[PDB]
């Protein structure tokens, strides 16, 4: 799993904890539209379509920015269940680069507050 994007931190952070951030789809120079969804039972994953937050390449295409990583909040599976404005260390959320095309999940299970 070389492109991929990940946070500093992995645990023990806060809702929003906003820290450095490097790894993505490793394009170059393009757009990664940060992401957050919610990996629970795998099956069971409530993606954030809220994210917003968006991280650039660097050369090699790896992103490097902030990210926020999120710790409470509403997330959804995809379209059959909804998670709900719920605490998401409790489903150990995640948070990876995001393309304008909604590429494949993310893997970052990061502890939240």
């Given at each position: 799993a070389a492109p991929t994007a990940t946070v500093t931190?992995?645990?023990?952070?806060?809702?929003?904890?906003?820290v450095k951030v490097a790894g993505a789809?490793?394009?170059?120079?393009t757009a990664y539209d940060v992401g957050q969804c919610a990996w629970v039972d795998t099956g069971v994953l409530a993606c954030?379509?809220?994210?917003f937050s968006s991280v650039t390449a660097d050369a090699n295409g790896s992103a490097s920015t902030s990210l926020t990583v999120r710790r409470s909040f509403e997330g959804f599976?995809?379209?059959?269940t909804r998670w709900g404005t719920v605490d998401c260390t409790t489903a150990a959320c995640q948070v990876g680069l995001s393309d304008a095309a909604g590429n494949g999940p993310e893997g970052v299970a990061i502890s939240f507050n």
């Open positions: 931190p992995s645990s023990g952070l806060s809702d929003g904890t906003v789809g490793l394009q170059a120079g954030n379509p809220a994210d599976l995809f379209d059959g």
